[PDB]
Amino acid sequence: IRENLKDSGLF
């Protein structure tokens, strides 16, 4: 899921 958070940019 790291790619989903990576998109948020909050991680």
UniProtKB/Swiss-Prot annotation:
Function according to Swiss-Prot or TrEMBL: Functions as a signal transducer for the rod photoreceptor RHO. Required for normal RHO-mediated light perception by the retina. Guanine nucleotide-binding proteins (G proteins) function as transducers downstream of G protein-coupled receptors (GPCRs), such as the photoreceptor RHO. The alpha chain contains the guanine nucleotide binding site and alternates between an active, GTP-bound state and an inactive, GDP-bound state. Activated RHO promotes GDP release and GTP binding. Signaling is mediated via downstream effector proteins, such as cGMP-phosphodiesterase.
- Secretion signal span: none
- Reported tissue expression: Rod.
Q: How does it assemble?
A: Heterotrimeric G proteins are composed of 3 subunits alpha, beta and gamma. The alpha chain contains the guanine nucleotide binding site. Interacts with RHO. Interacts with RGS9 and PDE6G. Interacts (when myristoylated) with UNC119; interaction is required for localization in sensory neurons.
- What is the protein name given in its UniProt record? Guanine nucleotide-binding protein G(t) subunit alpha-1
Enumerate the subcellular locations listed in this protein's record, separating them with semicolons: Cell projection, Cilium, Photoreceptor outer segment; Membrane; Photoreceptor inner segment
Q: Where is this region: Interaction with RHO?
A: 1-11
The organism that produces this protein has a lineage beginning with:
Eukaryota, Metazoa, Chordata, Craniata, Vertebrata
